Amino acid sequence: GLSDGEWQQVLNVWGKVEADIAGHGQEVLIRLFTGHPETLEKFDKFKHLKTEAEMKASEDLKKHGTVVLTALGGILKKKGHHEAELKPLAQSHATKHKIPIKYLEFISDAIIHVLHSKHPGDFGADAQGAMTKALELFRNDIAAKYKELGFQG
Ligand code: HEM
């Protein structure tokens, strides 16, 4: 798991996100969609977004970024005690949305990138280590639920 110190770093970084949840959310999704266009195909409601300018201009994309990062934030504040929060997420992304675990790796990487981009020189080596551990824990617990369901893609 994560140490007390590590959780404190995680929630300190998260305070930076919370100052502009929609901006961070928008940028996370744009990084994901532009880096991995196959992911855009999982969103019938974002399929019409044919350019990055269109992505930037979409208020609905910002709304969804808000929903996604609010859910992750709730999970992170549980400091690993997140079975109740995580289980329904795991189940909807496997059975309804059909999201391979690879795509959760992609969005985890996108969060790290966006943190550096929005906070250059203010996201230290210790903070990146801690946040990376937290995202891996999140991914690994979802992967366990995916294995239960026999889900691959
Ligand atoms: C940090 C990781 C993620 C979190 C916290 C998250 C959270 C959420 C939440 C809270 C919802 C709405 C409730 C639900 O349907 O369960 C949602 C919907 C959805 N998610 Fe995610 N998600 C994550 C990653 C992803 C990724 C990587 C993809 C695809 C590449 C994805 C695809 C979708 C789709 C297609 C919907 C339904 C969108 C719609 O309203 O049409 N999610 N997600």
From Swiss-Prot:
Gene3D superfamilies xref list: 6.10.140.2100, 6.10.140.2110
Origin: domain of life: Eukaryota
Keyword Metal-binding applies: yes
Swiss-Prot/TrEMBL catalytic activity: Fe(III)-heme b-[protein] + nitric oxide + H2O = Fe(II)-heme b-[protein] + nitrite + 2 H(+); H2O2 + AH2 = A + 2 H2O
Presence of keyword DNA-binding: no
Pfam families: Globin (PF00042)
Binding positions for O2 per the UniProt entry: 64
Span of domain Globin: 1-147
Annotated compartments: Cytoplasm, Sarcoplasm
Enzyme class: oxidoreductase
Enzyme Commission number, as recorded: 1.7.-.-, 1.11.1.-
Residues annotated for nitrite binding in this entry: 64
A single BP term in Gene Ontology: oxygen transport
Residues where Phosphoserine is found: 3
GO cellular component assignments: sarcoplasm
Membrane-traversing stretches: none
Annotated positions binding heme b: 93
Main subcellular location of this protein, as a coarse class: cytoplasm
Keywords (A to Z) from UniProt: Cytoplasm, Heme, Iron, Metal-binding, Muscle protein, Oxidoreductase, Oxygen transport, Phosphoprotein, Transport
Family according to the record: Belongs to the globin family.
Subunit field text: Monomeric.
Role, per record: Monomeric heme protein which primary function is to store oxygen and facilitate its diffusion within muscle tissues. Reversibly binds oxygen through a pentacoordinated heme iron and enables its timely and efficient release as needed during periods of heightened demand. Depending on the oxidative conditions of tissues and cells, and in addition to its ability to bind oxygen, it also has a nitrite reductase activity whereby it regulates the production of bioactive nitric oxide.
Annotated protein name in UniProt: Myoglobin
Lineage, uppermost ranks: Eukaryota, Metazoa, Chordata, Craniata, Vertebrata
